[PDB]
Design a protein around this ligand. Structure first.
Ligand SMILES: O=S(=O)([C@@H]1C[C@@H]2O[C@H]1C(c1ccc(O)cc1)=C2c1ccc(O)cc1)N1CCCc2ccccc21
Ligand SMILES: O=S(=O)([C@@H]1C[C@@H]2O[C@H]1C(c1ccc(O)cc1)=C2c1ccc(O)cc1)N1CCCc2ccccc21
Lengths: 221, 233
């Protein structure tokens, strides 16, 4: 069914699957871990709604989640903070400036400024967040049939991004230029995820990273 | 004048700029130890680096940047650039990484450095992906230039600094134009063109991942001062 969707159907699906913006519950690391943990529960249920994701085996679903989770968290943060220059909107009651580790903060800030400079639209945002889910773990995996399916869904999402842009009036040159601009930021999101994951470790927080079994269990629930 | 180039002139510039293929040390002691394999790899990478700076200086637009920004882009990109070169050299050697014509390593050989094998498998997967896609040489040089300009652009305050970033993004747009031109010229439909562009750019995210994972183990890394001195020479 996912491969028969039109660009409008794809966008409508992803917009309806969007998680809500959560609040923090009242240390800073404690507040952020608690927020991320509640965000993770919504992310599984969002992932199940990304067209094509539930066609994969449970093992492959876990592997993609297991690789994309912090990138998804981060891209959501950068989206939330777009309209707050100089600050990261972890939650509406948890808005941070740099003075409040700083290297990654600055990288997140730069990404928000870039989305702002590009006038990133929410319909584009949801497509990119789906791309991360399906792409981040695909090169590190039935497996053949599974990878083929993932790449066909990814092509569907490209088509949808191009359709969105054409509908907005972008020339053909502009469509491809913007498509390349958006995807290249995904290489910066990966970078930031890997450094975040390195920073979690150096803070002695290797325990907050969701394990394969946690994801599998959350997904079977 | 970099942004005045046509697509055909960009491809020609990038092809002419390609670095040479170097050899590894001749007849090393085999089987390798951890230390010895690392030694060989470090020595090869150190010598590749010099030619990488020569190549970088010929990537259109690169020398319009300040020396400080040129070094910053190379600090961020060098390992990704070495890795994409490795993956390209290895396309026609499934299951194997052609570090040099005289250093062709399979997976079991990666195990000799604890933790290496996981990056080894990622590199082999990327080479299989390029084979599956029938990556063309002209496309490869465009990709490798994208990594140089993009990897460090987001971590550059002043009018000049915004002009530097704007210049980088404009050159990146030109290379996008060039990739599309190559694809259209090959006969791909518009739909195919956009799909193939996305597929190529998404592989860049994986190469970044591998570079992050390998840099972690490096912690060998070329210093700011080394790169600056090489750039002025
Ligand atoms: O890289 S960080 O360690 C990590 C990435 C991002 O910020 C942190 C975090 C997180 C993830 C899962 C955890 O269990 C706990 C924390 C992130 C995050 C959380 C929710 C969200 O919706 C989006 C992103 N980091 C650097 C910059 C600022 C900062 C301040 C305090 C502590 C850490 C950091
Ligand atoms: O990703 S790795 O860090 C990096 C990729 C490739 O293998 C390594 C290497 C390299 C780079 C610079 C060095 O000074 C030394 C080694 C590589 C290399 C790639 C292209 C090229 O043209 C020349 C060298 N890595 C995996 C394999 C074994 C290994 C063992 C210990 C820690 C890391 C790794």
């Amino acid at each position: 069914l996912a491969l028969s969707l039109t660009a409008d159907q794809m966008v409508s699906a992803l917009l309806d699957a969007e998680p809500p913006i959560l609040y923090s519950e009242y240390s800073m690391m404690g507040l952020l871990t608690n927020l991320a943990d509640r965000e993770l529960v919504h992310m599984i249920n969002w992932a199940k709604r990304v067209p094509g994701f539930v066609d994969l085996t449970s093992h492959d679903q876990v592997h993609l989640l297991e690789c994309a989770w912090l990138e998804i968290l981060m891209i959501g943060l950068v989206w939330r903070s777009m309209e707050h220059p100089g600050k990261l909107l972890f939650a509406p009651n948890l808005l941070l400036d740099r003075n409040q580790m700083v290297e990654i903060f600055d990288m997140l800030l730069a990404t928000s400024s870039r989305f702002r400079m590009m006038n990133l639209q929410g319909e584009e945002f949801v497509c990119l967040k789906s791309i991360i889910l399906l792409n981040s773990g695909v090169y590190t995996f039935k497996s053949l049939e599974e990878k083929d399916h993932i790449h066909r869904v990814l092509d569907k999402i490209t088509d949808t991004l191009i359709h969105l842009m054409a509908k907005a009036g972008l020339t053909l040159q502009q469509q491809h230029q913007r498509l390349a601009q958006l995807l290249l930021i995904l290489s910066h999101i990966r970078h930031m995820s890997n450094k975040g994951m390195e920073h979690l470790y150096s803070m002695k927080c290797k325990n907050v990273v969701p394990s394969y079994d946690l994801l599998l269990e959350m997904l079977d629930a």
